[PDB]
């Protein structure tokens, strides 16, 4: 086509979606990870994770307001990944890399799994 | 912080939100523009437009499944802007620039209004 493009548009959209998350505006699901609860937007979770995409396209699960993750999932690893979904920034540290990689594999977040594998390979 | 950032994340998120729009997945509002209807995600509309941000943060309007725009609004101008919200690409043409600018002013989409004003000033 003959379209023009606004370079910062996608970043500005995600920044605003994160502002809605911070003020708990139009969040429509609770993700339960052991004793912790995380409120989020189903559409953002689907756009970032192959697992949430599969969950919320299911004719029964699409209507659930609460989703319980596998008990092996670490709440801190989930929190770091939820922050990444809404910001593009990943808080990857020596102390959390194993939990973050395991959580990204479960959530089906291929680019996160890839950088974790590379950071682990560098330290061996 | 000591975060790493995935450059393409925001663009990839918006691309997936547009795929959900195209398949009508988890759309939660109809925008009525004269005889035309446009299905969308409330969160994306709020993230792109000062008018939708004001509408869906209102305690009564946040619950509406149908929003009727002012009858002066052109459905084609709205369609072009809805496409821009989900893609960052604006189909700006000599034949539609006036309707697009009027619609972006009404929707409170400052960056679109700015490029329309510049393209109009160049042709005078």
């Amino acid at each position: 086509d003959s379209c023009i493009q606004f370079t910062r548009h996608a970043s500005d959209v995600l920044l605003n979606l994160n502002r809605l998350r911070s003020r708990d505006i139009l969040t429509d699901v609770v993700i339960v990870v052991s004793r912790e609860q995380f409120r989020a937007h189903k559409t953002v979770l689907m756009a970032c994770s192959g697992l949430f995409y599969s969950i919320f396209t299911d004719q029964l699960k699409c209507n659930l307001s609460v989703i319980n993750l596998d008990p092996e999932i670490n709440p801190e690893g989930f929190c770091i990944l939820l922050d990444f979904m809404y910001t593009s920034r990943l808080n990857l540290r020596e102390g959390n890399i194993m939990a973050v990689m395991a959580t990204a594999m479960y959530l089906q977040m291929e680019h996160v799994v890839d950088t974790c594998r590379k950071f682990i390979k560098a330290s061996e | 912080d000591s975060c790493i950032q995935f450059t393409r994340h925001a663009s990839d998120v918006l691309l997936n939100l547009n795929r959900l729009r195209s398949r009508d997945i988890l759309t939660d509002v109809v925008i009525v523009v004269s005889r035309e209807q446009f299905r969308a995600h409330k969160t994306v509309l709020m993230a792109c437009s000062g008018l939708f941000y004001s509408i869906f943060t209102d305690q009564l309007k946040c619950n509406l499944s149908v929003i009727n725009l002012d009858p002066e609004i052109n459905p084609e101008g709205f369609c072009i802007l809805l496409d821009f919200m989900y893609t960052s690409r604006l189909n700006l043409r000599e034949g539609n620039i006036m309707a697009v600018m009027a619609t972006a002013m009404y929707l409170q989409m400052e960056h679109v209004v700015d490029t329309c004003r510049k393209f109009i000033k160049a042709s005078e």
Partner: peptide, 4 residues
């Protein structure tokens, strides 16, 4: 704004 750019030409994509």
């Amino acid at each position: 704004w750019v030409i994509p």
